[PDB]
Amino acid sequence: YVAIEQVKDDGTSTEKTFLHLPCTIEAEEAEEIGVEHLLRDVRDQAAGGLSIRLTNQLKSLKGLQSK
Amino acid sequence: MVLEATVLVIDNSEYSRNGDFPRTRFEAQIDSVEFIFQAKRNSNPENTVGLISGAGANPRVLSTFTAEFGKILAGLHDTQIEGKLHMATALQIAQLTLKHRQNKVQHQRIVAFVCSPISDSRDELIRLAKTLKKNNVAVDIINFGEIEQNTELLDEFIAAVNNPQEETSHLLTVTPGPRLLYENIASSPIILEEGSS
Amino acid sequence: EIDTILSTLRMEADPSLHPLFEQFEKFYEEKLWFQLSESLTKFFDDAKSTPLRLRLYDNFVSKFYDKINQLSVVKYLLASLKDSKDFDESLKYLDDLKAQFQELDSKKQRNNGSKDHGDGILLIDSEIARTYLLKNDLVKARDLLDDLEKTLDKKDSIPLRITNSFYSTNSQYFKFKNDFNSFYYTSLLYLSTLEPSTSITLAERQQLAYDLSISALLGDKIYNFGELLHHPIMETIVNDSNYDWLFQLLNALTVGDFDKFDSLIKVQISKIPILAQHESFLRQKICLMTLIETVFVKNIRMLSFEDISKATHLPKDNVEHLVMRAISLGLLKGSIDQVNELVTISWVQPRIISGDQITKMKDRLVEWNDQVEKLGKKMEARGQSIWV
């Protein structure tokens, strides 16, 4: 979230607020080789084989419904 | 003064610019702050002083505990005069500032300059007063902004605080009319004040 | 010296306006610079109506400025030249004040340690621009506004009063050029952000309200009625004479009834010379409004022309043409088929938020939510064993 300053136009004064910015992960190369080496799990979703993405299909629906 | 840490609250409400003390009251208070700090240092080197604001919506730590007039004055040299007193918020925060200390044997004292009437419910400050005193924080008011344009309601509060404590609270009355702010404070007990210790 | 000026002011003043004058003399003396500002502030707000202002302001602005907040100095000057119907006078006093702030900051900045003086700069320039617009030296005004806009963006934030004054000047220029759409859009920004100063009175709401309403009536794309109501301007007052007929036009649009609309407008055509000559606009506007609304509420996104013919109360020859224009503007987008006399939309402007329409939103997302549920449970069962 980034603090922005903008007129909230409704008959209300200038409002200061925290607007969502999507964020992602990223790893430095130097860290990353070591991240991968630490990890060795079969994953909830890796985009691997048929059976793995199939699990993700069941998950993706239940995702949307709560959402 | 021996084994004592005193945070000065500087309050630079909109009644700080009032030219009652020459040239203005705001510049009169710098002279006052320099006055208190050098006197307490020379007397005892274990005396320490920090500088916080009573002004703005939420207080600002400008300085930590120090025996350095340079450190205090650098923060003081640039400060706003359009902030405003919010005494109730300030009281609870001053205590928190005071937990870190050069050493713990040093007492807990606030000296607060006052340039404007209270801006808070009267009844609340009485309750806060009695929370401070358990932990033995005593608060000495150099009063001169309350009696400009409002009645003196500070007496109630000073009585409430007053209990056996490391130091006692004091009401020292300074006339808002011209007399030079540092000058009244030099004649008032500031180092002739005393505790129950 | 100054005392002689104060005595003249008191003699001409009302007994009721005596205590404001008497407070200026004592507080100045007492060097209470807080009350010196407070007493003054009360005076300029309402006693600006009276000529009392000329003698008290100019003298105090040129003498004892340094003492009080700079903001308070420029606020009085603003009040004095509001009622001033002289432009030589106006231009003089501004140039003079600007010079004074420049000096003032040399001492003041160090003395307080922190204290802005850039507030007064912008406001001066905003006033000067405006002076030129009324003098109809439009070109000078244009470039001063542009410069202010650049300056302003370097700052992260300014006071409400600063952006309200920028906006006010800009809105004035736009109604002068009769750029109706831009007048109205900038006027909205003005209302939201408005000065906490109470210079704005009920009569000042009314003055502004006739122009705002005219600009949007003659439009074909302005649909900010919901924002309008909620803004101070129409919020507090609706029950004046200006807001009898004018507000009924406004209502008539919203309910989308052309029969009422026709009745009112004929009477208003003799009385109002703006409405006399812009007859064509008023009828076009109402047509586009009912049409964009009718498709929206329907979950069906195609409706025949013939039903639209009924809805807009215009023959079917005229409806086909109107719909060609709807695409051009981009208020609706879609395709046109005259092999069934249909309009099939693929895009519809968001309509204004009303309790009724929200209710439709709530249903739609409930409905979809049941499909999701039904599917995921069926999909669980089939291939139960493999979910590795």
UniProtKB/Swiss-Prot annotation, chain A:
Recount the PTM note.
N-acetylated by NAT1.
Q: Where is the signal peptide?
A: none
What is the similarity comment for this entry?
Belongs to the peptidase M67A family.
The miscellaneous annotation reads: Present with 19800 molecules/cell in log phase SD medium.
Its function, per the record, reads: Acts as a regulatory subunit of the 26S proteasome which is involved in the ATP-dependent degradation of ubiquitinated proteins.
Would you tell me the protein name for this molecule? 26S proteasome regulatory subunit RPN8
Q: Covered residues of the complete protein?
A: 137 to 203 of 338
Swiss-Prot record, chain B:
One MF annotation (Gene Ontology) recorded for this entry? K48-linked polyubiquitin modification-dependent protein binding
The alphabetized UniProt keywords are:
Proteasome, Ubl conjugation
Q: Null-mutant phenotype, please?
A: Cells are viable.
Q: Where does the record place a coiled coil?
A: none
Gene Ontology annotations for the cellular component aspect, listed alphabetically = cytosol; nucleus; proteasome complex; proteasome regulatory particle, base subcomplex
Q: Summarize the PTM comment.
A: Ubiquitinated, leading to its degradation. Ubiquitination is promoted by HUL5.
GO terms in the biological process aspect are: proteasome assembly; proteasome-mediated ubiquitin-dependent protein catabolic process; ubiquitin-dependent protein catabolic process
Tell me the ranges covered by the VWFA domain, including all copies: 5-190
Q: What else is known?
A: Present with 17200 molecules/cell in log phase SD medium.
Q: Which family does it belong to?
A: Belongs to the proteasome subunit S5A family.
This chain's function reads: Multiubiquitin binding protein.
Share what the entry says about its subunit structure, partners included. The 26S proteasome is composed of a core protease, known as the 20S proteasome, capped at one or both ends by the 19S regulatory complex (RC). The RC is composed of at least 18 different subunits in two subcomplexes, the base and the lid, which form the portions proximal and distal to the 20S proteolytic core, respectively.
What is the protein name given in its UniProt record? 26S proteasome regulatory subunit RPN10
Identify the taxonomic lineage of the organism of origin: Eukaryota, Fungi, Dikarya, Ascomycota, Saccharomycotina
- Encoding gene (name): RPN10
In terms of the parent sequence, the fragment covers: 1 to 197 of 268
UniProtKB/Swiss-Prot annotation, chain C:
Please provide an example of a Pfam family that matches this protein in its UniProt record. Rpn9_C
Name the GO cellular-component terms. cytosol; nucleus; proteasome complex; proteasome regulatory particle, lid subcomplex; proteasome storage granule
Q: Name one GO biological process term.
A: proteasome-mediated ubiquitin-dependent protein catabolic process
What sequence ranges are listed for the domain PCI?
Answer: 182-350
One term of GO molecular function = structural molecule activity
Q: What keywords does the record list, in alphabetical order?
A: Proteasome
Name the SMART domains on file: PINT (SM00088)
In which domain of life is the source organism classified? Eukaryota
Similarity comment: Belongs to the proteasome subunit S11 family.
Miscellaneous information on this protein: Present with 12400 molecules/cell in log phase SD medium.
- What PANTHER family does its record include? 26S PROTEASOME NON-ATPASE REGULATORY SUBUNIT 13
The free-text function statement in the UniProt record for this protein reads: Acts as a regulatory subunit of the 26S proteasome which is involved in the ATP-dependent degradation of ubiquitinated proteins.
How is this protein named in the record?
A: 26S proteasome regulatory subunit RPN9
Query: What is the protein's species of origin?
Result: Saccharomyces cerevisiae (strain ATCC 204508 / S288c) (Baker's yeast)
